[PDB]
Design a protein around this ligand. Structure first.
Ligand SMILES: CCCCCCCCCCCCCCCCCC(=O)OC[C@H](COP(=O)([O-])OCC(O)COP(=O)([O-])OC[C@@H](COC(=O)CCCCCCCCCCCCCCCCC)OC(=O)CCCCCCCCCCCCCCCCC)OC(=O)CCCCCCCCCCCCCCCCC
Ligand SMILES: CCCCCCCCCCCCCCCCCC(=O)OC[C@H](COP(=O)([O-])OCC(O)COP(=O)([O-])OC[C@@H](COC(=O)CCCCCCCCCCCCCCCCC)OC(=O)CCCCCCCCCCCCCCCCC)OC(=O)CCCCCCCCCCCCCCCCC
Ligand code: HEC
Ligand code: HEM
Ligand code: HEM
Ligand code: HEM
Ligand code: HEM
Ligand SMILES: C/C=C(C)/C=C/C=C/[C@H](OC)[C@@H](C)[C@@H](OC)[C@@H](C)CCc1oc2c(O)c(OC)cc(OC)c2c(=O)c1C
Ligand SMILES: C/C=C(C)/C=C/C=C/[C@H](OC)[C@@H](C)[C@@H](OC)[C@@H](C)CCc1oc2c(O)c(OC)cc(OC)c2c(=O)c1C
Ligand SMILES: COC1=C(OC)C(=O)C(CC=C(C)C)=C(C)C1=O
Ligand SMILES: COC1=C(OC)C(=O)C(CC=C(C)C)=C(C)C1=O
Lengths: 89, 49, 49, 62, 241, 365, 22, 73, 370, 74, 96
């Protein structure tokens, strides 16, 4: 399920053809507003623990916006994931 | 604390203690001729006899 | 007093007509004029309240 | 295999925001009653026999 | 003279921070004002209704109000008339105006007593000392007729003759009416007259202290919680070299 | 600067656009004359009426400051109604934030003028305080409690007059802060114009073009105000307020200030308490609905004949309601007022949106 | 979605508040 | 909104004269009146009728009111 | 709606090390709101006619529900206002905050406006202090040559303090606080251009933290302490900082023999009283406050704050002790030896600010070799 | 003034713990008192003297005043 | 108020002195009568409206300071009223 969740938020980089039309809200906002050069969610596993999160690369003036949208997306999945975005993931 | 404070302020706008001090009124009926509506000031409002 | 279509009272503010019983008969008022507590005492007196 | 009080308070009351608020509403009404009753008792005891409510019986009958 | 004698501190039962007034003492104090002081001193800001639930029941206060006649009117003939007092009436004034008061008191003016305790440094300590401190003029001091020596009054020459003494009145509860007892009760009553909110502010003050005893360390805990991120942070400088 | 001097403005806004600055001037005028009157006014019921006559008879130029304040309130409403009318006709209401703040401004000015009228404590002062505060009694369960709480007692009395002086004193400054917010939202878009078409291709600087035009407008406002103050200071007032308040008697031909007559006619047309109060509230609050009722593909009514005809019918109808509000509750005024009241809501809720759709059809879009 | 359950505890809050507070 | 950032315009020329070189009231009456008359006529059919209606309702209602207050209307 | 509420609060950059001395700015904002809130509620029951002013105040305290708490909260709140004002100014002098010239000078205007505001409020209950305070202070203007007396009578609305005076003072006292609020917002806007100074006097751009949650919670804690101090006064000693003579209605025929100003005006009153010349005392009074505008021009130290300046610190506390001396003297009769102590304290006040401190600054610079 | 545009900083590392992982009152008394004592000692010689002077002037002046109001046998 | 309007200061002074007004209290705490002066307001014929109504078969003569501004028609109304008394029309009978 975490992998599905991470697929919903996805990854992104300035060379993606999708742009404003990308399904992931984070990727879409990032592209239209030029919030980052790139980002990727990740789920690094170890025996009984791991790191579940994301990494992003951006201009010095976009860090706060990136963080805001990224966390807003985690929060939206916790309380409001939709069947259709989940099927997509 | 907010509940108490706020309610004390709101309360200051309600009728003050002097306004609440009410009493009865006696009216001499022989002074009101038949057909007449007499008006008296009572407990803040008009009292018709 | 003595105005309106019932020889009772007429309220000039928005046209409420009352009868000589103080009952609302026409206009926007919802209720009959209030009847206070009172008692007829000795003499020709009435104590209201 | 057993939690602590705070862990239980966390899970059932504080975690969800809707429940963290109901907890405060309820706690506030309960605290108000207990605090006012308690403080009033302390004040009246410190001043036992001096307040109108303490000597009132002697004059009442009205 | 310009010499001053300041009053000592009496241990009033309402002196403490959380100490309320003694209401039986307020009640006797009112009897003193009524029986003794009211013939010369007004108390324009206190009404009979203010006594209810303080030192008299509603019926007792009504009965007290009816013991006096107050002016009312105009009636239907345009004339003023007298009627028994009621709860809403303020305590009767002994004089119509200050000029008349002075005329009735060799030119001196008995001040209104509603706020006398708050209007004088020393408050009831001052008033109690004044009432119980009349004495003979010291050697070499001769006062004009009309004046009495009182070491606590500024200048020591006052236009008020000693108003109280043993048995000046009889209390409803049989308390021995010694001069000092009468002085102590009227002063307690005067404190209540000048500050009717007295007992309520202290009860509130108790609640305020308790709430602060709770809220201050809790907010402080909230402050340290948030600030811990910064207070324990560690820095390191790693320049290239 | 850039909030005034180099503010871009449409090259074609007409005199109908002068009322915003005129409202600013009416507000300043009321504040200035108001403060000076407050330097001599006392709010105790035993002396309020007296202090006002003292201002007019013995304070140097007290009479001119007083009548300027009274007539200034009338000019304020003339300008407010012209300002709102301009907005409806030209579709300025599409600037939603600016428009809704404007609605708040209208209600606050109404409340403000109501309370000021109570201050001299004449007959109209007293009964106006009685009636208007009682509107709240229509609120179920707690209405009566709200009224007594506002009054500070069981009837309008001293407690009422004293707090009303305080409310009337501070509200205009609140209005000033709300008006500044009104302008800030406007500045985000700049002004609309008679054509309803974007004027970005032909903007001119506010200074000197509109600064001088606003000054000319200000001069005309002052002429109108002073014609009233110096030649007919009582024309727009009510003789009954020259009679001290009498709690035992409501004047037989009592009527509201002229700028409240249309709303009073609407309330009076409904023989039900709650219904009349709801119609009154709605006659003003419906302004907040205008944007949602816009069906035309075009912003302004300049190019819309049918809409224009209905717009003037609405103005003529408000004129009818104003006249009816000044007449006794007798035949045939009772029926004319009911029709006019119904026509008011019908024009706004149904006829205008419908004319908008028909016009669209006729233009093939 | 979660909005009913959330709008239902937000509902409650307002209610309890008024009830109590008022 | 600032000059320099309002919108895009191309190929438009504007010619103007200094206010000191021209009259402030050119053909004020000779051309102003005709224009006022034109504007007045162009709107009259849209503005006037509702007010004429008001007038009729006003005179009718007032007369009806008086008539109703007497013995023989 | 978001921005300017946000970038003007939430993400406002703040020094990581500002101390409790930086809490007084928000405490002043709170004192202002308190005064405005209790003020409006009192104004709902107060009447400004001389025949009924004093009475309306007793009616508030005796019959209006909770009228007494609102009244004493307003009276004692004015005292808290000054305590905070003086702490705020002291912080500024000690840490060199005055180098923010616009913010500082607006602050000087704020101090004067609050003083004028508090003065007028004190006149409203029309007790003895009200009446003589109105008389004396308005008369300060009579020191103005040629028109002084005319200005006074114009302010009074007559040849003496009377009805016209009380009524306009209610109006002035009513509106001034809102003007103070607008001036304070300007105070803050200029401050935001630079951000805050800190105890070290060294730029804190390399170590800023967001105002929220660090200072929002710290300010709340400060607000609680302010409320505790206020309520200790209101509930346990409401008259402690007041004057018994104002419980006596105004008497135009008699000035109380031991009349003395409100405690927060005592230092300035002591200074004026020390000069046996009318104009001289008025100028010294005006200058005792206006000299604050000169502090920036008198800064000689190469360092902004007094934190690293021992000599300047000693002189700073001597100034505070001196103001304490003047406050004490202002409460004493004009008799020996108080007349001389007060004159020395008055001279010492201007000497510390105009001469000793600038000199300590230069000496410290020399000791550090720059 | 906005984060991202304050100033230039290079080669500085900052380590921090979540407030939920740490104590809000670490060594409150064990280390707090020593620090209060130190701070108090460091400033006392700069703060106290002027106030001691005030105390001396205050007691001297008050006494001198009382003395002057009495027993002047002439 | 009459000075410089319809009477000289001395004429108005003489007018005021034609009446006696109450003043006081004096040093004995009593009220007394004195000749009127320029600062006195015109004497009231009755101490209160009740006395006025009593003296006028129950009707209240209104104060006249603002009567012209307090009545539609102003002086046209007042002039018409004063000069318009006439016999009741046939069929109209008024109470005493
Ligand atoms: C009761 C309500 C009281 C409220 C207070 C008053 C509010 C006043 C609103 C502001 C109106 C004044 C204003 O600034 O508009 C200028 C307005 C515009 O006229 P303009 O400057 O001649 O502009 C020429 C037209 O754009 C070009 O049109 P034109 O060629 O047809 O000429 C029109 C002009 C000249 O035509 C003739 O009459 C000839 O007629 C006039 O307006 C005069 O002039 C006036 O209405 C006031 C002139 C008074 C002197
Ligand atoms: C009443 C007068 C009228 C004025 C109105 C009242 C307003 C009060 C001014 C605002 C200050 C409030 C405030 O923000 O308090 C922060 C401040 C919080 O200090 P903190 O969180 O412990 O800071 C640690 C120090 O930076 C590091 O210091 P440390 O580790 O050496 O320990 C010191 C600390 C703990 O040391 C011990 O006492 C143990 O003692 C306290 O500060 C307590 O509390 C105070 O300074 C108390 C205010 C005194 C009044
Ligand atoms: C009239 C016969 C009096 C009686 C009975 C009492 N008092 Fe009196 N009192 C009287 C006068 C004329 C004066 C004025 C004295 C002066 O020289 O100014 C006073 C004054 C007081 C005062 C005020 C003292 C002050 O500091 O100014 C007090 C506190 C006082 N009186 C109290 C008081 C009380 C409580 C009495 C009943 C026990 C009482 N007085 C009786 C005249 C008369
Ligand atoms: C104290 C009251 C008010 C003041 C001081 C005020 C002031 C202004 C000002 C200065 C302008 C710009 C000039 C103009 O175009 O007129 C303006 C525009 C506007 N106002 Fe108001 N206003 C007030 C009330 C209102 C009301 C009551 C409404 C409508 C309900 C409103 C709606 C608008 C709109 C929509 C605009 C944009 C106009 C356009 O560009 O076409 N205003 N106002
Ligand atoms: C939106 C602005 C304002 C409006 C619309 C307004 C309106 C009014 C109205 C209608 C009256 C009744 C006038 C009369 O017939 O006597 C009045 C009275 C008064 N107003 Fe205002 N007012 C405004 C602002 C102010 C301000 C700011 C003050 C004072 C600080 C003020 C002070 C007074 C006073 C003291 C009176 C009573 C004397 C009088 O009746 O003239 N007003 N006001
Ligand atoms: C109604 C009065 C006042 C209000 C509401 C007020 C408010 C504030 C606020 C909220 C701040 C930021 C927080 C702080 O550092 O305390 C501030 C800073 C400041 N204020 Fe005030 N102030 C007032 C009076 C004054 C006075 C009388 C002065 C000085 C003559 C002054 C000088 C300053 C200065 C220079 C700063 C910068 C502090 C620093 O960063 O070191 N203020 N004030
Ligand atoms: C900078 C804010 C303010 C300050 C410093 C201030 C100060 C004062 C002072 C020192 C007094 C005398 C208190 C006493 O009775 O001993 C007073 C009285 C008064 N103030 Fe204020 N005030 C402020 C704001 C306001 C505002 C905004 C209003 C009203 C809108 C107001 C209304 C009053 C009233 C009605 C009184 C008379 C009643 C009383 O004495 O408590 N004040 N004020
Ligand atoms: C403490 C503050 C309070 C309670 C404020 C309340 C404000 C309410 C509204 O303003 C927003 C209100 C003024 C506004 O309603 C939208 C008006 C158009 C209502 C107009 C109005 O006036 C009357 C009036 O003036 C009178 O004068 C003698 C007499 C009146 O009937 C006898 C009326 C009346 O029947 C109505 C409907
Ligand atoms: C219409 C508005 C007007 C005229 C405003 C004027 C404001 C002036 C100043 O504020 C800016 C002023 C309040 C401020 O001077 C800087 C104070 C420190 C002055 C302090 C002050 O107080 C006294 C006082 O309170 C008294 O009370 C009973 C009695 C007093 O002597 C008998 C004084 C006194 O001798 C002085 C110097
Ligand atoms: C852009 O709209 C505006 C006006 O309309 C012409 C004004 O008159 C005034 C005056 C202001 C401030 C304004 O912003
Ligand atoms: C950092 O400077 C400021 C404060 O000091 C901590 C404030 O309290 C407040 C409140 C504001 C707005 C502010 O800018």
């Amino acid at each position: 399920a975490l992998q599905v969740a991470n697929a919903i938020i996805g990854h992104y980089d300035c060379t993606y053809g999708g742009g404003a039309h990308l399904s992931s809200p984070l990727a879409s906002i990032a592209a239209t507003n030029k919030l980052c050069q790139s980002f990727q969610t990740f789920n690094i596993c170890y025996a009984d623990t791991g790191l579940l999160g994301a990494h992003f690369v951006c201009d010095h003036m976009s860090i706060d916006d990136m963080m805001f949208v990224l966390q807003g997306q985690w929060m939206r999945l916790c309380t409001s994931a939709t069947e259709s975005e989940v099927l997509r993931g | 604390a907010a509940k108490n404070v706020v309610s004390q302020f709101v309360s200051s706008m309600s009728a003050s203690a002097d306004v609440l001090a009410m009493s009865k009124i006696e009216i001499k009926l022989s002074d009101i001729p038949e057909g007449k509506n007499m008006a008296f000031k009572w407990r803040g409002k008009p009292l018709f006899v | 007093a003595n105005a309106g279509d019932f020889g009772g009272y007429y309220c000039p503010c928005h046209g409420s007509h009352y009868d000589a019983s103080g009952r609302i008969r026409k206009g926007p008022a919802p209720l009959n004029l209030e009847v206070p507590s009172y008692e007829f005492t000795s003499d020709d007196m009435v104590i209201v309240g | 295999v057993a939690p602590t009080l705070t862990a239980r308070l966390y899970s059932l009351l504080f975690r969800r925001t809707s429940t963290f608020a109901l907890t405060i509403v309820v706690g506030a009404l309960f605290f108000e009653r207990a605090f006012d009753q308690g403080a009033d008792a302390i004040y009246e005891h410190i001043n036992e026999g001096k307040l109108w409510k303490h000597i009132k019986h002697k004059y009442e009958n009205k | 003279s310009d010499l001053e004698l300041h009053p000592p501190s009496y241990p009033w039962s309402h002196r403490g921070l959380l100490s309320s007034l003694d209401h039986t003492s307020i009640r006797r104090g009112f009897q003193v004002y009524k029986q003794v002081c009211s013939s010369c001193h007004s108390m324009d800001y206190v009404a009979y209704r203010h006594l209810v639930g303080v030192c008299y029941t509603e019926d007792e206060a009504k009965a007290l109000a009816e013991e006096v006649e107050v002016q009312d009117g105009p009636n239907e003939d345009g004339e003023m008339f007298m009627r028994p007092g009621k709860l809403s009436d303020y305590f009767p004034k002994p004089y119509p105006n200050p000029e008349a008061a002075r005329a009735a008191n060799n030119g001196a003016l008995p001040p209104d007593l509603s706020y006398i305790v708050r209007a004088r440094h020393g408050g009831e300590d001052y008033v109690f000392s004044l009432l119980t401190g009349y004495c003979e003029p010291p050697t070499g001091v001769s006062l004009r007729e009309g004046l009495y020596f009182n070491p606590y009054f500024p200048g020591q020459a006052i236009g008020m003759a000693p108003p109280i003494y043993n048995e000046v009145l009889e209390f409803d509860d049989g308390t021995p009416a010694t001069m000092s007892q009468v002085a102590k009760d009227v002063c307690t009553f005067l404190r209540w007259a000048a500050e009717p909110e007295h007992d309520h502010r202290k009860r509130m003050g108790l609640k305020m202290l308790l709430m602060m005893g709770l809220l201050l360390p809790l907010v402080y805990a909230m402050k340290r919680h948030k600030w811990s991120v910064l207070k324990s942070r560690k820095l390191a400088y790693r320049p290239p070299k | 600067n850039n909030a005034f001097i180099d503010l871009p403005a449409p090259s074609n806004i007409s005199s109908w656009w002068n009322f915003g600055s005129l409202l600013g001037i009416c507000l300043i005028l009321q504040i200035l004359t108001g403060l000076f009157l407050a330097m001599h006014y006392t709010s105790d019921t035993t002396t309020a009426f007296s202090s006002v006559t003292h201002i007019c008879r013995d304070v140097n130029y007290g009479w001119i400051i007083r009548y300027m304040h009274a007539n200034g309130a009338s000019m304020f409403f003339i300008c407010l109604y012209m300002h709102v009318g301009r907005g409806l006709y030209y579709g300025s209401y599409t600037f939603l934030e600016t428009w809704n703040i404007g609605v708040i401004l209208l209600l606050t000015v109404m409340a403000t003028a109501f309370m000021g009228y109570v201050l001299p404590w004449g007959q109209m002062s007293f009964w106006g305080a009685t009636v208007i505060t009682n509107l709240l009694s229509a609120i179920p369960y707690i209405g009566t409690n709200l009224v007594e709480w506002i009054w500070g007692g069981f009837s309008v009395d001293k407690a009422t007059l004293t707090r009303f002086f305080a409310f009337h004193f501070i509200l205009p400054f609140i209005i000033m802060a709300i008006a500044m917010v009104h302008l800030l939202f406007l500045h985000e878009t700049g002004s609309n114009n008679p054509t309803g078409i974007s004027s970005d291709v032909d903007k001119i600087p506010f200074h000197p073009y509109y600064t001088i035009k606003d000054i000319l407008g200000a001069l005309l406002l002052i002429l109108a105000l002073m014609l009233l103050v110096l030649f007919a200071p009582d024309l727009l007032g009510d003789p009954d307020n020259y009679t001290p308040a009498n709690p035992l008697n409501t004047p037989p031909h009592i009527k509201p200030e002229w700028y409240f007559l249309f709303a009073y006619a609407i309330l009076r047309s409904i023989p039900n308490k709650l219904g009349g109060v709801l119609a009154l509230a709605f006659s003003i609050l419906i302004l907040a609905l205008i944007p949602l009722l816009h069906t035309s593909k075009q912003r302004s009514m300049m190019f819309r004949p049918l809409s224009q005809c209905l717009f003037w019918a609405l103005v003529a109808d408000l004129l009818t309601l104003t006249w009816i509000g000044g007449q006794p509750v007798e035949h045939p005024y009772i029926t004319i007022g009911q029709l006019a009241s119904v026509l008011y809501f019908l024009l706004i809720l149904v006829l205008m949106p419908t004319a908008g759709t028909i016009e669209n059809k006729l233009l093939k879009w | 979605r979660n909005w009913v359950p959330t709008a239902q505890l937000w509902g409650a809050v307002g209610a309890v508040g008024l009830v109590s507070a008022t | 909104r600032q000059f320099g950032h309002l919108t895009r315009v191309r190929h438009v020329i504007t010619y103007s004269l200094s206010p000191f070189e021209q009259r402030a009231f050119p053909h004020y009456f000779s051309k102003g009146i005709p224009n006022v008359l034109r504007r007045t006529r162009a709107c009259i059919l849209r503005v006037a009728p509702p007010f004429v209606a008001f007038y009729l309702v006003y005179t009718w209602g007032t007369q009806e009111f008086e008539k109703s207050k007497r013995k023989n209307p």
